[PDB]
Design a protein around this ligand. Structure first.
Ligand code: IAC
Length: 121
């Protein structure tokens, strides 16, 4: 679920999902179009594609379980949708962590009209 993803993001990065990743660039927090602005935005692009891979799942609301084995996120077994959603979220959270070094506040609340053109998953 969105709230669990948000908790995972905070755990990984020390930033609050809202507002740090809820309106960032072209793909974080609402997705759509455009060339992703930076590596963090590319995490969101891929995450959006990942959810797009699951047309008959409900990633915003369906809850999954995960644990930590040392630092590492381990998605625990639920329904197939839950497992797949968890893997999407885990990847995005890791990606955000890997790209924290280039995160830029100037991309928070990024205006939609600067995001143009379809980029295929
Ligand atoms: O529902 C959405 O697509 C947007 C959304 C609402 N609150 C959020 C918190 C963190 C990340 C995305 C969202």
């Amino acid at each position: 679920s969105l709230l669990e993803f948000g908790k995972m993001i905070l755990e990984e990065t020390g930033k609050l999902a809202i507002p740090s990743y809820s309106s960032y660039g072209c793909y974080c927090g609402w997705g759509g179009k455009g060339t992703p602005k930076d590596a963090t935005d590319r995490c969101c692009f891929v995450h959006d594609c990942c959810y797009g891979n699951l047309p008959d799942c409900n990633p915003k609301s369906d809850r999954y379980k995960y644990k930590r084995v040392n630092g590492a996120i381990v998605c625990e077994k639920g329904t197939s949708c839950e497992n797949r959603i968890c893997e999407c979220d885990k990847a995005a959270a890791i990606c955000f962590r890997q790209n924290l070094n280039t995160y830029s506040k100037k991309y928070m609340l990024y205006p939609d009209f600067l995001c143009k053109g379809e980029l295929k998953c």
